[PDB]
Amino acid sequence: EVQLVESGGGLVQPGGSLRLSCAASGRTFSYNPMGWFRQAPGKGRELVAAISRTGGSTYYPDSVEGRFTISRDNAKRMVYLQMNSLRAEDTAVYYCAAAGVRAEDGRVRTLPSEYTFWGQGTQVTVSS
Amino acid sequence: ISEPPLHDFYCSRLLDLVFLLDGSSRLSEAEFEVLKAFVVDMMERLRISQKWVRVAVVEYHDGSHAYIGLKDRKRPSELRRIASQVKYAGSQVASTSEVLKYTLFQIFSKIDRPEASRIALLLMASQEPQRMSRNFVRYVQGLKKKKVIVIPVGIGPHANLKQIRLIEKQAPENKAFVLSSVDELEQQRDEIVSYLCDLAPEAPP
């Protein structure tokens, strides 16, 4: 139905910067609300960033306000995670997801169970 | 591919949707402009394509003036511009019986898209002469047999409630919205487009 492909992960210096890309494809793709999640060593999946269908609305947990900007370009069927002033704890596998529950409503989605389609993951390691 | 969503709400389903606009003087020129705006807002909240939502726009007086057919392969922005430029008729009569016959024999003469739901959004402000209603139930029954859902929207105190209730009787998905005026259309828009979207399937290919 929906295929999501993350790219652009790698190693960075603490306080460094990194842009993640996600290429969305498939017939049923309708510019769904999207979200970036992560799994850090020994931890559950965390939503770090969510965006409405149009991009006019965004959600980040207070913990990461100022360190992540989610954006999207619907003409290219892309979504992005700008990572800024990176820390040790930002080391994790980063997943791009899309809401398939009531897709017609393109408002930002914070409930992780409403995210239905998932990419393969991209590793970000913040080290020396 | 071609043209991204204008709003957060965006119906990506298999739907043949027909907008039927009362052309009688029961609406002022200014009230008719409000009706077209509602139609253009609706169109902006649909994924318009031969694969997803197909739209038709007809204005009805004692006859039917089609401006867009379901099959007209044009750019959504072009289709919406056409809808915004439908002319005020301000006619003496608007015949629900005639525009339902047109929809039955001219729009839904054959079912290209059995995979899609088919919807007639009958936007009513007036009451046709009782001489013109001879075959009214016949044509609604003909639409129920072609699996066309008729959704009557009565606008204002002159809309024919007898006929709206009649349409609801003839079939259970046939469901009505009774509005006190055109200004209520914008209030009611999000509920209406949500209802229309839910009657349709997500790609059952």
Author numbering:
A (entry chain B): 2 to 129
B (entry chain A): 1262 to 1466
Sentences copied from the publication:
Caplacizumab is composed of two copies of the nanobody PMP12A2h1 (designated as VHH81 in this paper) linked by a tri-alanine sequence. Through binding of various truncated AIM-A1 proteins with a FLAG-tagged VHH81, the binding epitope of VHH81 was mapped to include VWF residues 1261–1267 as VHH81 bound with high affinity to tAIM-A1 (containing VWF residues 1261–1472) and other NAIM-containing proteins, but not A1-CAIM. To further characterize the interaction of VHH81 with AIM-A1, the crystal structure of a complex of VHH81 with a VWF fragment 1238–1481 was determined to 2.1-Å resolution. In the structure, many residues, including residues 1262–1267 and some in the A1 domain, are in direct contact with all three complementarity-determining regions (CDR) loops of VHH81. For instance, VWF residue R1274 forms a salt bridge to the side chain of E105 in CDR3, and residues 1262–1267 pack around Y32 in CDR1. Some CAIM residues also make contact with VHH81, such as the side chain of E1463 with backbone amides of R103 and A104 in CDR3. Also pertinent to this study is the hydrogen bond between side chains of E1264 and R1341, which has not been observed in any previous structures of A1. Moreover, comparison of the AIM-A1/VHH81 complex structure to previously reported A1 structures, especially the A1/LBD complex structure, reveals that the largest difference in VWF conformation lies in the α1β2 loop, as well as NAIM and CAIM residues, such that these residues appear to move away from the α1β2 loop upon binding of the LBD. VHH81 binding increased significantly the unfolding force for AIM-A1 at all loading rates and did not alter its contour length. VHH81 stabilizes the AIM-A1 interface, as exemplified by the interaction between residues 1341 and 1264, and increases the unfolding force threshold for the AIM.
